[PDB]
Design a protein around this ligand. Structure first.
Ligand SMILES: O=C1C[C@@H](c2ccc(O)cc2)Oc2cc(O)cc(O)c21
Ligand SMILES: O=C(O)CCC(=O)C(=O)O
Ligand SMILES: [Fe+2]
Length: 348
């Protein structure tokens, strides 16, 4: 076996990328210059959602917020969050600590290398081919469980930079509170009791927050490749930071919309797990990630997910009728992931 990193391929002095990184000729049609795509204000754009009044003591103004967030969720299922209560300073500590880890040599990152053949999923990694097409994506990553503190294996966290562990686990901490509030509003928006969605996905007890730093090296032929493939997140909610480089695209009314770079904001996705519980009301949107020649892109995605086995996920009884039956049969989290894999496995 051989290990190989996109970061290495990027610094090897290649003018054309390998065959495995080129998208199918059908998919190449839709890939354009991310920078030009960033300069278009024509057509649908991702909503920006202001969360200032999400817990507001004036019910008139709290309710307002809940409606914008609901509408945003029913429509797009993705949005830029502003005024979300996470310190701007703390967001910078996290990005700085992640930029520093990735600026170590590959050889020093390899010390944290994951090992999927032995079930070591946490760590420094790069996505291996997983069906008959050998397709790879133009990214390396760092993945670990983040919250709750008691479930973390800190021995896989970067010790250099020194501020990595503290920054990340205060961010997670802060993210869990935000998630509680979001779940609260989503719950109300749907008409349920306010605690509901959080306990259906696991509560404080069982809900997991996974951190994945997506590291997109510069790419010499960016318009042939993807950073991350077209997919929906399996999560209940995903929160994303990035280094103000464009690349996120959303598949919205039949076309690929590019996200803009809003400073001090957080991309939040509605994920499959909420879509299932809500019977398709809230949308787990399809999305992907483009690379470029000029700039390293980095994003920090935190996936708030249920326990893999323990909770049988399915549409809520409140959320089904004769007039609108269950759109999804019951599956555990792990089963849901497998059904998706199984589906995609069918190349040939
Ligand atoms: O979209 C993904 C990527 C995935 C993942 C990446 C790397 C790895 O080594 C293992 C898993 O983790 C997740 C976990 C979530 O609940 C929800 C998600 O949507 C995802
Ligand atoms: O890097 C990004 O902005 C996209 C991240 C993404 O879709 C993922 O990590 O699941
Ligand atoms: Fe995603």
């Amino acid at each position: 076996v051989a290990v190989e990193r996109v970061e290495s391929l990027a610094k090897s002095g290649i003018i054309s990328i390998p065959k495995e990184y080129i998208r199918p000729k059908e998919e190449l049609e839709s890939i354009n210059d991310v920078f030009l795509e960033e300069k278009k204000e024509d057509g649908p754009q991702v909503p920006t959602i202001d969360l200032k009044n999400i817990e507001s003591d004036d019910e008139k103004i709290r309710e307002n917020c809940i409606e914008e967030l609901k509408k945003a969720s029913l429509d797009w299922g993705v949005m830029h969050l502003i005024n979300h209560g996470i310190p701007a300073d703390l967001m910078e500590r996290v990005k700085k600590a992640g930029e520093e880890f990735f600026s170590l040599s590959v050889e020093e990152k390899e010390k944290y290398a994951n090992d999927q053949a032995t079930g070591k999923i946490q760590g420094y990694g790069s996505k291996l081919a997983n069906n008959a097409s050998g397709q790879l994506e133009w990214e390396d990553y760092f993945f670990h469980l983040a919250y709750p503190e008691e479930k973390r294996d800190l021995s896989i966290w970067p010790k250099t930079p020194s501020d990595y562990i503290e920054a990340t686990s205060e961010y997670a901490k802060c993210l869990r509170l935000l998630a509680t509030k979001v779940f609260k509003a989503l719950s109300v928006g749907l008409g349920l009791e306010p605690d509901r969605l959080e306990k259906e996905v696991g509560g404080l007890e069982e809900l997991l927050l996974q951190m994945k730093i997506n590291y997109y090296p510069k790419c010499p032929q960016p318009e042939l490749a993807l950073g991350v493939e077209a997919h929906t997140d399996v999560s209940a909610l995903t929160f994303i930071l990035h280094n103000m480089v464009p690349g996120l695209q959303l598949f919205y009314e039949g076309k690929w919309v590019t996200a803009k770079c809003v400073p001090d904001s957080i991309v939040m996705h509605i994920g499959d797990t909420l879509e299932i519980l809500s019977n398709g009301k809230y949308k787990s949107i399809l999305h992907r990630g483009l690379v470029n020649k000029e700039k390293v892109r980095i994003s920090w995605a935190v996936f708030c997910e249920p326990p893999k086995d323990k909770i049988v996920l399915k549409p809520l009884p409140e959320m089904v009728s004769v007039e609108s039956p269950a759109k999804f049969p019951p599956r555990t989290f792990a089963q849901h992931i497998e059904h998706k894999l199984f589906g995609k496995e069918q190349e040939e």
